[PDB]
Paper text:
Kinetoplastids are evolutionarily divergent eukaryotes that have an unconventional set of kinetochore proteins.
We obtained crystals of BsKKT2572–668, which corresponds to residues 569–664 in T. brucei KKT2, and determined its structure to 1.8-Å resolution by zinc single-wavelength anomalous dispersion (Zn-SAD) phasing. Our analysis revealed the presence of two distinct zinc-binding domains: The N-terminal one (referred to as the CL domain for its key role in centromere localization; see below) consists of two β-sheets (where β-strands 1, 4, and 5 comprise the first β-sheet, and β-strands 2 and 3 comprise the second β-sheet) and one α-helix, while the C-terminal one consists of one β-sheet (comprising β-strands 6 and 7) and one α-helix. The CL domain coordinates two zinc ions and the C-terminal domain coordinates one zinc ion. The closest structural homologue of the BsKKT2 CL domain was the atypical C1 domain of the Vav1 protein (root mean square deviation [RMSD]: 2.7 Å across 52 Cα). Coordination of one zinc ion in the BsKKT2 CL domain occurs via the N-terminal residues Cys580 and His584, while that in the Vav1 C1 domain occurs via the N-terminal His516 and C-terminal Cys564. More importantly, the CL domain does not have the HX12CX2CXnCX2CX4HX2CX7C motif that is present in all C1 domains. Structural analysis of the C-terminal zinc-binding domain of BsKKT2 revealed a classical C2H2-type zinc finger. The C-terminal zinc-binding domain of BsKKT2 consists of one C2H2 domain (−1: Ser653; 2: Thr655; 3: Lys656; 6: Tyr659). The crystal structure of the B. saltans KKT2 central domain revealed a unique structure, which consists of two distinct zinc-binding domains, the CL domain and C2H2-type zinc finger.
Numbering used by the authors: 570 to 668
């Protein structure tokens, strides 16, 4: 249950994103889903925002400047948007329609 206001820090499917300013153990990091910058360690200079339900990870620079991916991949069965074909493919394997 989350619908961001236009221009708020949101994921591609308009949910509010959680800021992660600390690192858990076993943290593998990610490549920013918007700019592709590697984010291997969370610090005060380089931190992340995440939407858990979308598996959407963005660096603080892209999130706060409202940068968006210029290519969107959509699931035909539920309409959900993804930043890559690989993430759409992982979703699609287990999707037969809206949850
Ligand atoms: Cl839209
Ligand atoms: Zn980024
Ligand atoms: Zn989301
Ligand atoms: Zn789907």
């Amino acid at each position: 249950g989350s619908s961001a206001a236009p221009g708020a820090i949101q994921c591609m499917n308009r949910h509010k994103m959680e800021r992660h300013g600390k690192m858990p153990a076993g943290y593998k990091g990610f490549d920013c889903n918007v700019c592709d910058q590697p984010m291997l360690k969370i610090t005060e200079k380089a931190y992340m925002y995440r939407c858990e339900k979308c598996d959407y990870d963005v660096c603080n620079q892209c999130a706060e400047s409202r940068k968006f991916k210029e290519v969107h991949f959509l699931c035909a069965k539920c309409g959900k948007k993804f930043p890559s074909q690989t993430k759409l493919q992982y979703h699609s394997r287990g999707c037969r329609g809206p949850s």
